[PDB]
Structure formats: C-alpha cells, structure tokens
C-alpha cells in the first residue's frame, strides 16, 4: 500500500514497515498479481536457488542495521509487490506479514 518509484539500473531500497528491536530474522517475498509468491531471503541473508544475485539483503550484524531489500540492476520482471516478514526476540510470534509495498518503476 506504500508506493515507491525507482529508475532503471538503479539500486532499489525497500524499507520494512516495521522496525527492529533486538535480534531479527527477516523474510522477503515477491508477489506479482496473479502469480505465486516466491521466497527471496530467509535468515536475513540466505538466498535459495532460482533467485538471481541481483536481489540482496543486509546481514544481521549487531543492532541498529535497518532491514532493507536491495535490487541491483532492476529489470522489467521486478514489477510486483514486495513483502517484509519479520521475526524478532521480543514481539513474540509474528502472526501478521505487516505492510505491503507497491513497487512501480
């Protein structure tokens, strides 16, 4: 529901709708309308096979690092809705995905 506009070839910076307290484990999802969601980042840096290395995330080194999804070399296939699914050590079970980001280049 939050629009973000970037140009072609730039590095897109998608910030999470919720901020970090304590140690975190953030999951990132790409959701084209009418298409299945795909796992991009789990355990805050691990990238499963099938995901190109254009998509990258920040490692969890100490406290204060903002969770941000990096899209280096954006293409036409990146037009989708991007999700930050956050877990942390003090908010307990995270039943909700949080806010959704509507990305349009």
């Amino acid at each position: 529901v939050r629009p973000l506009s970037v140009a072609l070839g730039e590095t897109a910076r998608i910030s999470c709708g919720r901020q970090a307290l304590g140690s975190r484990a953030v999951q990132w999802y790409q959701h084209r309308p009418g298409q299945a969601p795909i796992l991009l980042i789990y355990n805050n840096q691990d990238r499963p096979s099938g995901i190109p290395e254009r998509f990258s995330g920040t490692p969890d080194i100490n406290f204060g690092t903002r969770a941000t999804l990096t899209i280096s070399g954006v293409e036409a296939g990146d037009e989708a809705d991007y999700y930050c699914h956050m877990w942390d050590s003090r908010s307990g079970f995270s039943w909700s995905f949080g806010g959704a980001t509507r990305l349009t280049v």
């Binding site: 999951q27 995905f97 959704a100």
Partner: protein, 128 residues
C-alpha cells in the same frame, strides 16, 4: 514440490469453505504445512498452519473461528472455514513451511525463537 488446490467457489454465509490441495513428489513427514489467504485490496493474511502431530495454532486476529485439518490417508492438505463473511471473499494459496531456528543466546536457557519460511506456493483460487 507442486501444490494444486481446488475449491467450491461460492457458499452462503455461515457455511464451510473446503479447499483440497493435492501434493505430489515427496513424503509428508519431512515438512510443515500451512494455508495462506489474500483479501482483495489488502495484504496477505495468515489463517493458520498444521503440524505433523495434528496441532494447529490460530490467529488471535481471527478469534479462533478457523479450523485447519489434515488427512494423510489420501495425500492432501485440508481446510474448513465456518462462519464466513463477505470479507472472506479472497484468493487462497497453499504452501509448506520450514521451521527455522535463529539462536541469539544460550540454547539451554530457551533463548531462541522459531520462524517458518515458505518456499513453494500454489497458483491461487478465487471463491466468493
């Protein structure tokens, strides 16, 4: 891992929505299983997930009106949803869950939390 779902499409209010997802390729014992809902104009809403030993935890936001059940006799994941509303007219997706464990302290003190990652998803079916 492929998941293919099928639903009834339309029920009257306070009737049970039952979608059947066929899973093929791998064994049932090795993964956790879940169900995903997506309201139009809104985000993705969790409705719950099922464990191996038939234990399901439900949303406090949904006020425990959703029941996620399992029948391993015919190799499929099941869903039932009673007391339906026009706000439940949404697209339903099926997925599996991998229980990840992120350690931040001493394991023996319980200084850890469990998280689930969803890697394979269905195509989505629309019911109204």
């Amino acid at each position: 891992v492929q998941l293919q779902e099928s639903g009834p499409g339309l029920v009257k209010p306070s009737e049970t929505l039952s979608v059947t997802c066929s899973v093929s390729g791998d064994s049932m014992n090795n993964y956790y299983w879940t169900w995903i809902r997506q309201s139009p104009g809104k985000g993705l809403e969790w409705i719950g997930y099922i464990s191996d030993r038939e234990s399901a935890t439900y949303n406090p936001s949904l006020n425990s009106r959703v029941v996620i059940s399992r029948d391993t006799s015919k190799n499929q994941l099941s869903l039932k949803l009673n007391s339906v509303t026009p706000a439940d007219t949404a697209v339903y997706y099926c997925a599996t869950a991998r229980r990840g464990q992120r350690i931040y302290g001493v394991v023996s003190f319980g200084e850890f939390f469990y998280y689930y990652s969803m890697d394979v998803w269905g195509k989505g079916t629309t019911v109204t």
